[PDB]
Design a protein around this motif. Structure first.
Motif, short mmCIF file in Angstrom:
data_model
loop_
_atom_site.label_atom_id
_atom_site.label_comp_id
_atom_site.label_asym_id
_atom_site.label_seq_id
_atom_site.Cartn_x
_atom_site.Cartn_y
_atom_site.Cartn_z
N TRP D 38 -27.15 36.70 -39.50
CA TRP D 38 -26.84 36.93 -38.09
C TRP D 38 -27.93 37.81 -37.48
N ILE D 39 -27.96 37.85 -36.16
CA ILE D 39 -29.05 38.46 -35.40
C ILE D 39 -28.52 39.73 -34.73
N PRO D 40 -29.12 40.89 -34.97
CA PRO D 40 -28.66 42.12 -34.32
C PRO D 40 -29.18 42.24 -32.89
N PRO D 93 -30.57 59.94 -22.94
CA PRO D 93 -29.63 60.74 -23.73
C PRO D 93 -28.27 60.93 -23.08
N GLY D 94 -28.02 60.33 -21.92
CA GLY D 94 -26.74 60.48 -21.26
C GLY D 94 -25.97 59.19 -21.07
N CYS D 95 -25.99 58.32 -22.08
CA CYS D 95 -25.34 57.02 -21.99
C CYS D 95 -24.77 56.64 -23.35
N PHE D 96 -23.93 55.61 -23.35
CA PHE D 96 -23.33 55.06 -24.56
C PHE D 96 -24.27 54.04 -25.19
N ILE D 97 -24.07 53.79 -26.48
CA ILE D 97 -24.87 52.82 -27.22
C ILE D 97 -23.94 52.00 -28.11
N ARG D 98 -24.14 50.68 -28.11
CA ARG D 98 -23.29 49.77 -28.86
C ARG D 98 -24.16 48.72 -29.54
N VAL D 99 -23.74 48.28 -30.73
CA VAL D 99 -24.49 47.33 -31.54
C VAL D 99 -23.73 46.02 -31.63
N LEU D 100 -24.45 44.90 -31.54
CA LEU D 100 -23.86 43.57 -31.54
C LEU D 100 -24.39 42.75 -32.72
N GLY D 101 -24.01 41.47 -32.74
CA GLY D 101 -24.47 40.51 -33.72
C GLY D 101 -24.09 39.10 -33.32
N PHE D 102 -25.04 38.18 -33.33
CA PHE D 102 -24.84 36.84 -32.81
C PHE D 102 -24.77 35.80 -33.92
N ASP D 103 -24.15 34.67 -33.59
CA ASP D 103 -24.13 33.48 -34.43
C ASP D 103 -24.46 32.28 -33.56
N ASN D 104 -25.35 31.41 -34.05
CA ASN D 104 -25.80 30.27 -33.27
C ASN D 104 -25.14 28.96 -33.66
N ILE D 105 -24.60 28.85 -34.87
CA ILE D 105 -23.87 27.64 -35.25
C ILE D 105 -22.59 27.48 -34.43
N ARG D 106 -21.84 28.56 -34.24
CA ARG D 106 -20.60 28.52 -33.48
C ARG D 106 -20.70 29.17 -32.11
N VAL D 108 -20.82 32.45 -30.97
CA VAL D 108 -19.92 33.57 -30.68
C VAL D 108 -20.51 34.83 -31.29
N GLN D 109 -19.99 35.97 -30.85
CA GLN D 109 -20.35 37.25 -31.45
C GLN D 109 -19.46 37.52 -32.66
N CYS D 110 -19.88 38.50 -33.47
CA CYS D 110 -19.18 38.79 -34.71
C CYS D 110 -18.90 40.27 -34.95
N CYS D 111 -19.62 41.18 -34.31
CA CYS D 111 -19.44 42.60 -34.57
C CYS D 111 -19.68 43.38 -33.28
#
Lengths: 118, 118, 118, 118
Positions: D38-40, D93-106, D108-111
Motif C-alpha cells: 500500500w502507498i502512504p 507547528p500549530g496544526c494536526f497531522i494524520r497518516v493515510l494509506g491507499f489501495d488501487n485494486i479496490r 479505497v483507503q485502509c488506515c
C-alpha cells in the motif's frame, strides 16, 4: 405604582417566584414523595438555554440533561437522598442541579425543582 | 464638492436631521398635542436594532418597546408630563426613551420622537 | 519540491500575483486608458468579504462600493487623476481604494486594480 | 460506581481510546502496511470541526484536508516515511497531522490515525 424589571431577570419554573429555599424546606418535599411510592433521581447541565427550528411545530432544543448515576430503586429514608447532593456539588461546582421523581403506573414525572446555581 | 460620511452615522427617524433638541423646544410639541385632545405615553428599550425573516413579506423584528406605567387619561397641563421624564432617566440610565401620542377616534398614533440617548 | 501556503493568504484579483506595484507603474496604466477615450473613477470600502444565499443561483453579497465624488467627464491629463488619490487617503486612512474605467459605446467596464491597503 | 466526564472530552476516531501512542508503536503500524503493498501519504489542517445542512441527507463539512507533497510511489523502507514527519512539524507547528494509506485494486483507503496535536 411600580414597574417590573425587564433587564436580566431569568426564571426557573416551579417555586421560582417564592423567597429562596432553605434546608428543612427541601427535606419535606422528599417525605411527601416517598409516602406516595415514587422514585427519585438527579441531573446536571452547564447551560439552561433553548432554541427552535424554522418551520417545525413542537420542536425545541435543550430539554435533556445528564443523569448522575442511576435511579434509586428501593429507597425508604430521606437520608441517602440528602447525602448524594454533596458528592455531586464537589465534583462539578460549575453547573446546575435538578431533582426529579418517577411514576411507573402512569409513566410520567411528578416533581422538578432546582437546588443549586453556579 | 463634499462627501456624506458613510461610517458610523445612524439616524433615528423624525426630527433627526436638525440641530440637537433643547428645552423650550420639547415643551412646545406637547402643547400642540394637548390642544388637539390626544393622550401622551412613554417607552424605553436598550437596543434599537431590526431583523428580518427568510421569505415572509411585511415582517420585521424590534418594533415593540416597554411601557412606563400607563397612558395618562385626563392630563391637562404640560408639567406632569415633564416631571415624569426624570424618574425614568434615574432608574434606567442606560436605555433610550421615546414619547408617543394616541388618538381614539381614528385609532392611530400621531407623534414619535426621542428625548434621551445612552 | 515546495508547498503553497494555505494559511492567511488572501488575493485581490487582477495583477495580484506579481511583485508589489510602485509609482511610474501606476501612471502608465492611466495613459493607456486615456488614449482609448475612457472615463476614470474611484471607490472605497472598509471590508472586502462576500456572502451567499441558501438556494438562489447567481446571487452574492459585497459587490458594491462607495463612489468618491463623481465620474470625471473630460479629463485629458494624468495629473488630476494622480492628485485625487491623496485627498481620499488622508480622510479615510482605514479603507481600501480601487480605480475603475467606463466605456459608453458598449456599456461595460475596462479595468480595476487596487492602489492602497489599510 | 463511576461517572463518565461529559465536559471537554473530544475524541479522534480509531485508536483514540487507548493509552497515548509512543515510538516503536508507530513504526510497527507502517511495516504491516508496506508488506501488503500500500502507498502512504500525509495530511494537515488547523481545525477538526464539522457542520451540516438544513435538509440534505448525507452532507457534512470538514472532511477534506491538505496534502503535504505527493503520494510516495515506490517506497520500500520505513525510514523515508519517518523522516518526513519532522519537516512537516517544523513548518506548521500549530496544526494536526494524520497518516493515510491507499489501495488501487479496490480503490479505497485502509488506515488513518493522528500523530500530532497542537
Amino acid at each position: 405604582m411600580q414597574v417590573w424589571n425587564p433587564i436580566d431577570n431569568p426564571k426557573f419554573e416551579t417555586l421560582s417566584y417564592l423567597p429562596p429555599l432553605t434546608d428543612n424546606q427541601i427535606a419535606r418535599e422528599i417525605d411527601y414523595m416517598l409516602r406516595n411510592k415514587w422514585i427519585p433521581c438527579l441531573e446536571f447541565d452547564p447551560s439552561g438555554t433553548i432554541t427552535t427550528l424554522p418551520g417545525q411545530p413542537g420542536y425545541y432544543g435543550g430539554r435533556y440533561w445528564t443523569m448522575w448515576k442511576l435511579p434509586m430503586f428501593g429507597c425508604n429514608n430521606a437520608g441517602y437522598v440528602l447525602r448524594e447532593i454533596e458528592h455531586c456539588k464537589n465534583a462539578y461546582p460549575g453547573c446546575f442541579i435538578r431533582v426529579l421523581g418517577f411514576d411507573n403506573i402512569r409513566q410520567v414525572q411528578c416533581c422538578a425543582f432546582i437546588v443549586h446555581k453556579p
